[PDB]
């Protein structure tokens, strides 16, 4: 109830979309860490990676591989760039809804946070 | 002339964690948190830019293992981090795909 990326993906709340598809939906980050910082969420509310079962494992899959589409479109691809997972507060997350993070636009450096 | 390659088929020993028929796990060497774990394809691909979608079979499975390990390392709600870096402007050195499984410690932002 309440999820933020469920009210994007219902239209409910301004984001910039940059893809999207019949499972699956891109968007800016507002709070963009890297010159380029694009999210990539199912349409269905999974909370966490830890709750990506088979039967969503392919769906999971299906995000990473538009991410790399994206980073492609977008331009990001021939220098570089990253993709995060976040999962728990430990691990950075802050909305229960999963989402793949793609970074770009200048050099990613070491460690990743 | 892969180094990933050569660790996957056993010409060069790793701290491995997991090993399946399309999949291996190995700790990193040079850490960057308490649990820092490699998860790396059999089958070599060299950069994420390479994808393509008859891959969400193999990409599924790392992710699941991915999630798995971090399950029995102790990790699933203390919290964990997952990186592909892509490229040389994405930190990649190693030219075969490889999951970073990061936790043990608060992970910070931005990520590197
Ligand atoms: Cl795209
Ligand atoms: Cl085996
Ligand atoms: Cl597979
Ligand atoms: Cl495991
Ligand atoms: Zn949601
Ligand atoms: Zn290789």
Do not use: G, Q, T
């Given at each position: 109830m309440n999820c933020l990326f469920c009210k994007i993906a219902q239209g409910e709340i301004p984001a910039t979309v940059v893809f999207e598809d019949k499972n699956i939906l891109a968007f800016r980050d507002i709070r963009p860490q890297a010159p380029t910082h694009l999210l990539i969420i199912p349409k269905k509310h999974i909370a966490t990676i830890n709750?990506?079962?088979?039967?969503?494992?392919?769906?999971?899959?299906?995000?990473?591989?538009?991410?790399?589409?994206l980073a492609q479109a977008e331009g990001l691809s021939e220098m570089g760039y990253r993709l995060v997972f976040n999962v728990n507060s430990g691990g950075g997350q802050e909305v229960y809804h999963i989402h793949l993070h793609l970074l770009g636009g200048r050099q990613m450096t070491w460690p990743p946070g």
């Open positions: 709750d990506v079962n088979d039967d969503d494992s392919e769906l999971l899959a299906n995000i990473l591989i538009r991410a790399k589409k």
